[PDB]
Scaffold this active site. Sequence first.
Site, PDB file in Angstrom:
ATOM      1  N   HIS A 164      -0.040   1.456  10.637  1.00 33.27           N
ATOM      2  CA  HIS A 164      -0.628   0.543  11.118  1.00 33.27           C
ATOM      3  C   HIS A 164      -0.647   0.633  12.761  1.00 33.27           C
ATOM      4  O   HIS A 164      -1.117  -0.124  13.815  1.00 33.27           O
ATOM      5  CB  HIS A 164       0.477  -1.119  11.549  1.00 33.27           C
ATOM      6  CG  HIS A 164       0.953  -1.319  10.301  1.00 33.27           C
ATOM      7  ND1 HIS A 164       1.839  -0.753   9.339  1.00 33.27           N
ATOM      8  CD2 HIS A 164       0.300  -2.070   9.215  1.00 33.27           C
ATOM      9  CE1 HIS A 164       1.468  -1.496   7.892  1.00 33.27           C
ATOM     10  NE2 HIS A 164       0.943  -2.160   8.523  1.00 33.27           N
ATOM     11  N   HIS A 198       7.896  -2.667   9.499  1.00 33.28           N
ATOM     12  CA  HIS A 198       7.506  -3.420   9.142  1.00 33.28           C
ATOM     13  C   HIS A 198       6.358  -4.420   9.707  1.00 33.28           C
ATOM     14  O   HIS A 198       6.680  -5.144  10.720  1.00 33.28           O
ATOM     15  CB  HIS A 198       7.954  -3.957   8.091  1.00 33.28           C
ATOM     16  CG  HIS A 198       9.080  -3.129   6.883  1.00 33.28           C
ATOM     17  ND1 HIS A 198       8.580  -2.906   6.083  1.00 33.28           N
ATOM     18  CD2 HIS A 198       9.776  -3.546   6.677  1.00 33.28           C
ATOM     19  CE1 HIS A 198       9.246  -2.352   5.953  1.00 33.28           C
ATOM     20  NE2 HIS A 198      10.041  -2.483   5.676  1.00 33.28           N
ATOM     21  N   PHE A 199       4.583  -4.501   9.525  1.00 29.94           N
ATOM     22  CA  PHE A 199       4.410  -5.368  10.082  1.00 29.94           C
ATOM     23  C   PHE A 199       3.967  -6.623   9.454  1.00 29.94           C
ATOM     24  O   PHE A 199       4.059  -6.386   7.743  1.00 29.94           O
ATOM     25  CB  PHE A 199       2.712  -4.166  10.270  1.00 29.94           C
ATOM     26  CG  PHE A 199       1.623  -4.793  11.057  1.00 29.94           C
ATOM     27  CD1 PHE A 199       1.112  -6.490  10.336  1.00 29.94           C
ATOM     28  CD2 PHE A 199       0.962  -5.058  11.686  1.00 29.94           C
ATOM     29  CE1 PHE A 199      -0.456  -7.318  10.741  1.00 29.94           C
ATOM     30  CE2 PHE A 199       0.227  -5.522  12.352  1.00 29.94           C
ATOM     31  CZ  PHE A 199      -0.025  -6.537  11.977  1.00 29.94           C
TER      32      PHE A 199
END
Length: 256
Positions: free
Chosen positions: A144, A251-252
């Site tokens: 990411h 986490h995205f």
Amino acid sequence: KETAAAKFERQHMDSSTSAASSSNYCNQMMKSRNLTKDRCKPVNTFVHESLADVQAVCSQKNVACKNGQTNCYQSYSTMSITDCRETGSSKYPNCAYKTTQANKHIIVACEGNPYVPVHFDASVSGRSGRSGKETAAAKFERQHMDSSTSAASSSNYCNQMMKSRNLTKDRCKPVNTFVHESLADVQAVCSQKNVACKNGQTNCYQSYSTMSITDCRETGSSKYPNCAYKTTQANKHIIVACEGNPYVPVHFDASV
């Protein structure tokens, strides 16, 4: 006056060739690159990848440098390299070298603005047991973060990045977002606007500011192993899940 970056290019970059194919490669290269001018440099490694690809390593896996500094980076991908090691019979000025081709991850030290390689620290293979564990935080960075560029410049960005970040290994990851901000700015989101995550947990945070992001989404016609993506550049707030000590993105969750 040679800058550190230029010196790294002279000492460690060989993009002209994709690999050493001659046992005389090192003999020739160590000489032409001035690595045997005042003495036979005992050991040296040449990287057979594009300069762009090697500079990109400066925004890959952050690892401790051998000297204890923190500005080293391990390539996500293995790269073609050639190690040169002086032979026992080598005698200045006729410096002689054994040429060894391998494919390993590289570790470089980076400095400057732009952030570019200035030293070659090491090479590592997965088979050696030294490439290391990938933490959740490191995986978040791999999937990411793209701090190397301010925005997607072309329509092929996602095709390239999805592959290079190893998101098309066994199948095409259908949707993925890359963030074009500093790691510091993204890590800071963990102290910004607390919100629920999509999964109902409450360790998510929305960035106060909009950020430069690229959305990658598989095309309708895409089929593994030939994964194809549409690239969409945007400025949106990001929402990340944070965990651990230090409390960092793992986490995205979404962009809004």
